[PDB]
Amino acid sequence: SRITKFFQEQPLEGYTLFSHRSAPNGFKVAIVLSELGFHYNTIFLDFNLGEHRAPEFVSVNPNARVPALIDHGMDNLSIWESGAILLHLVNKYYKETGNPLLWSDDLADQSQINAWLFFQTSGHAPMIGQALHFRYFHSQKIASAVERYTDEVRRVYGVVEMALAERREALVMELDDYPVWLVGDKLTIADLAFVPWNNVVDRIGINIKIEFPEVYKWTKHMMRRPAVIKALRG
Amino acid sequence: VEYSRITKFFQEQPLEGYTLFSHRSAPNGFKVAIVLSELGFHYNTIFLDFNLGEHRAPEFVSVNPNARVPALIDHGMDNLSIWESGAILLHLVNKYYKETGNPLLWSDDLADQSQINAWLFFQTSGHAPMIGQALHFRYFHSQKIASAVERYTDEVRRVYGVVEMALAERREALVMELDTSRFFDYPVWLVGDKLTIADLAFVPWNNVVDRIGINIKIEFPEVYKWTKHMMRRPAVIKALRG
Ligand SMILES: N[C@@H](CCC(=O)N[C@@H](CS)C(=O)NCC(=O)O)C(=O)O
């Protein structure tokens, strides 16, 4: 219950992140949190000891998974889905700052960003997770099952790859080496949501540098960003 | 592969309003319709013929790069195009909010918005997909894999447990909040003690789970009442029916 008295004298400001030393989705919030300049504690839970299943924590995230973020300033608000946490942070920053950093003050851009973000957490992350399970942890080796998800994951990358190619193509049509982004010709939580998972697809035989050119650049760019490194060391 | 029809659509696009690209067996398609309907937004639905490869129409893969449904076009906003059911809902509730002043199925307070998304993502991230895999192995995979079918059926029963537990707490709340009992059948919601897109998002699928052998009414009491109130609403009925 190391989480108990952590709930009897909580901070007056700042944030407390609930992640795991390997949870890619946990890294999603770290990166965004660092990028926006928010100061935050980080509590790494141990799945094996079942800590993400203990009472005091599912009181924070009923689903009992990571990440989960306590917003101390907002009277210790609890947000749990990584996607929910990102939209909360960029919203929170735009409200305090007046500058849509990693976000957008335009409605059509927000929709396009939410689109790529929902697509990421629902069509990209889950499938990868599934691919990982059948290749490394499922109670039995079943190729058809692994192929299913690795294939789907390639379908997804093909989607983003073609998307980035059109953006590039659009840029290059500037005949009178630049980074490309999914929305608004600017980096947003739409792009950063993919990096944590992009760095792990090799464990399932997907070579981005060889298979997805525009994606390799897109992600080489994000990986070179301090915050992404400044919090990817586990 | 005949999408000569879909191509015609993109040359003569309506002035303003909304067009929805869905399919008669797409729960997520109806999740959109249901909300598009609760907010009073008029719209025409195009049911893409996947068998004819209409979802591969170059014109359609520009609106929705992922060639999947739903997909909503906001003609009013210069034919803008949103493609994730979750992204479509948020578009609607925000659009509705700045155009009326009243956040129907939404919330005007930052906190409540975070809590609504939480459930919303949970529904699009952990609910729909697992139900899609359970359904896949139990019915369409290339071979029988009982362990794969059990794995996903369990996840669906586990996520349902989360919602059920969530709704149970909300009930206990209201109760010991005016009984200082009859109020054991007063409508309850996930956030703000009001119906929101957080709640509605689930109804389309909640009628799909019998196919994987889950009996909500017998196994999820709180969920059962929850879905039944939403099902009695005129706007919901019109949506699922059309
Ligand atoms: N839909 C959630 C997924 C949460 C999730 O599955 N998190 C993983 C870590 S990436 C976890 O908690 N795994 C522990 C387990 O499954 O027991 C999100 O995107 O935040």
UniProtKB/Swiss-Prot annotation, chain A:
It comes from the Eukaryota. GO terms for cellular component: cytoplasm. The keyword Acetylation applies. It catalyses: 2 glutathione + H2O2 = glutathione disulfide + 2 H2O. Keywords: Acetylation, Amyloid, Cytoplasm, Nitrate assimilation, Oxidoreductase, Prion. It is found in: Cytoplasm. Glutathione binds at residues 25, 52, 65-66, 81-82. One of its GO terms (molecular function) is transcription corepressor activity. Changing residue 23 to S: Reduces glutaredoxin activity. Homodimer. Interacts with NNK1. Belongs to the GST superfamily. The prion domain (PrD) is a Gln/Asn (Q/N)-rich domain, which is unstructured in its native, soluble form, and which forms a parallel in-register beta-sheet in its amyloid form. This is Transcriptional regulator URE2. The chain holds residues 100 to 353 of 354 of the full protein.
UniProtKB/Swiss-Prot annotation, chain B:
Glutathione binds at residues 28, 55, 68-69, 84-85. Its EC number is 1.8.4.-, 1.11.1.9. Keywords: Acetylation, Amyloid, Cytoplasm, Nitrate assimilation, Oxidoreductase, Prion. It is an enzyme of class 1 (oxidoreductase). GO terms for biological process: negative regulation of transcription by transcription factor localization; nitrate assimilation; protein urmylation; regulation of nitrogen utilization. GO terms for molecular function: glutathione peroxidase activity; glutathione transferase activity; phosphoprotein binding; transcription corepressor activity. Homodimer. Interacts with NNK1. This is Transcriptional regulator URE2. The chain holds residues 97 to 353 of 354 of the full protein.
